[PDB]
Amino acid sequence: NEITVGITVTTTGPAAALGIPERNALEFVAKEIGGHPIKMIVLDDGGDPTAATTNARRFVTESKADVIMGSSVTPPTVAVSNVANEAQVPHIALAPLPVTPERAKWSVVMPQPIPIMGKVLYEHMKKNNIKTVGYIGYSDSYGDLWFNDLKKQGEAMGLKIVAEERFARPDTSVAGQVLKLVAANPDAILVGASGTAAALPQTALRERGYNGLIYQTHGAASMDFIRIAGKSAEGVLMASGPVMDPEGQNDSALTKKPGLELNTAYETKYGPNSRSQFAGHSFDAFKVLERVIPVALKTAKPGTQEFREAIRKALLTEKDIAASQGVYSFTETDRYGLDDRSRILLTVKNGKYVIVK
Ligand SMILES: O=C(O)C(=O)Cc1ccc(O)cc1
Numbered sequence: 001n002e003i004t005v006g007i008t009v010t011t012t013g014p015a016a017a018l019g020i021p022e023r024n025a026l027e028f029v030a031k032e033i034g035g036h037p038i039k040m041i042v043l044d045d046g047g048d049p050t051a052a053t054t055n056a057r058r059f060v061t062e063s064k065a066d067v068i069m070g071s072s073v074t075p076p077t078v079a080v081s082n083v084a085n086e087a088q089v090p091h092i093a094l095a096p097l098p099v100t101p102e103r104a105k106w107s108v109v110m111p112q113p114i115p116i117m118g119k120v121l122y123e124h125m126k127k128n129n130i131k132t133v134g135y136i137g138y139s140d141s142y143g144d145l146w147f148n149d150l151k152k153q154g155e156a157m158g159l160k161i162v163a164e165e166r167f168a169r170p171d172t173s174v175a176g177q178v179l180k181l182v183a184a185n186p187d188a189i190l191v192g193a194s195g196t197a198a199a200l201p202q203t204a205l206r207e208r209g210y211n212g213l214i215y216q217t218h219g220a221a222s223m224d225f226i227r228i229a230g231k232s233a234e235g236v237l238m239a240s241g242p243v244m245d246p247e248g249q250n251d252s253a254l255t256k257k258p259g260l261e262l263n264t265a266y267e268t269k270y271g272p273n274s275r276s277q278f279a280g281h282s283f284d285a286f287k288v289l290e291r292v293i294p295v296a297l298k299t300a301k302p303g304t305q306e307f308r309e310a311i312r313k314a315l316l317t318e319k320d321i322a323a324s325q326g327v328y329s330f331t332e333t334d335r336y337g338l339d340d341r342s343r344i345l346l347t348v349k350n351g352k353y354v355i356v357k
């Protein structure tokens with residue numbers, strides 16, 4: 001009578017810094033929901049889309065999963081969503097992705113959508129005298145989501161995009177891209193990357209004498225960024241989920257209690273400042289399950305296709321789902337389901353994250 005949840009995340013390779021906290025956070029989620037035990041099957045995919053496809057396929061067929069979850073970065077998350085939408089199994093994505101008609105029916109997304117994160121960054125650029133903006137980001141759909149958003153929102157707000165450079169996830173140098181960005185000398189540069197890679201343009205730009213403002217995505221929101229960037233991290237502007245600072249929230253924020261619950265558990269085990277954007281997502285996915293499971297049980301039983309459907313329909317009917325990273329209300333067309341309560345703006349002062357109000 002167990003409910004089966006298959007989870008594929010990235011605990012090896014360049015994106016381990018994202019998947020490791022995601023896996024680690026599972027220690028702190030409910031393993032009994034709606035009066036049923038939860039059976040979790042957790043597999044590494046190394047960030048590889050083929051491996052992620054394979055993991056997801058096996059969860060849905062061999063493990064007869066009721067829900068599948070993952071992956072840690074966009075390319076394998078697209079792969080998982082494609083399996084979910086063909087096999088007709090609810091999928092909770094732990095990385096942002098382009099939600100096309102192919103993907104929208106069966107996938108919902110825990111991380112904040114790019115445009116919400118972009119808007120807070122671009123409003124800061126406007127307030128801080130920025131006229132020209134350069135971009136460096138992955139040469140894949142994550143880097144595309146961010147560049148497209150920068151151009152679309154940015155130009156509408158009167159910013160001028162003056163350079164675009166890309167680099168691949170495994171790359172350890174961005175020398176050629178930085179040379180071009182430095183020569184263009186934009187007032188600000190947006191880095192579209194994540195984890196350890198996000199710190200690569202941060203250090204390379206400062207080392208080459210760039211003095212403009214540097215903006216980072218929510219893909220950079222863990223202590224790994226400050227560890228790796230060092231002094232180059234100072235003064236960065238970074239979009240983040242609210243889980244990075246539940247202490248600072250008003251008691252009236254529905255995200256405060258779940259943020260405090262997660263962070264107290266996580267930091268007790270893993271040490272000071274070990275909170276992350278990413279631990280927030282897997283923890284939140286279970287907050288979502290705690291709302292939708294008891295609703296699905298009213299009409300269906302675990303291990304059937306009807307239960308998959310009932311969960312999918314509950315995702316549409318259950319509104320205002322409180323979690324550490326925001327308050328979720330999904331629709332047929334909005335698979336992120338988040339608003340302004342799902343983001344804050346961080347900077348780094350003396351090796352510590354601080355909120356910019
Ligand atoms: O690198 C990638 O592809 C990402 O998708 C990283 C990422 C993961 C979770 C977030 O909340 C923000 C960005």
Ligand SMILES: [Pr+3]
Pocket residue numbers: 299300306
């Ligand atoms: Pr029935």
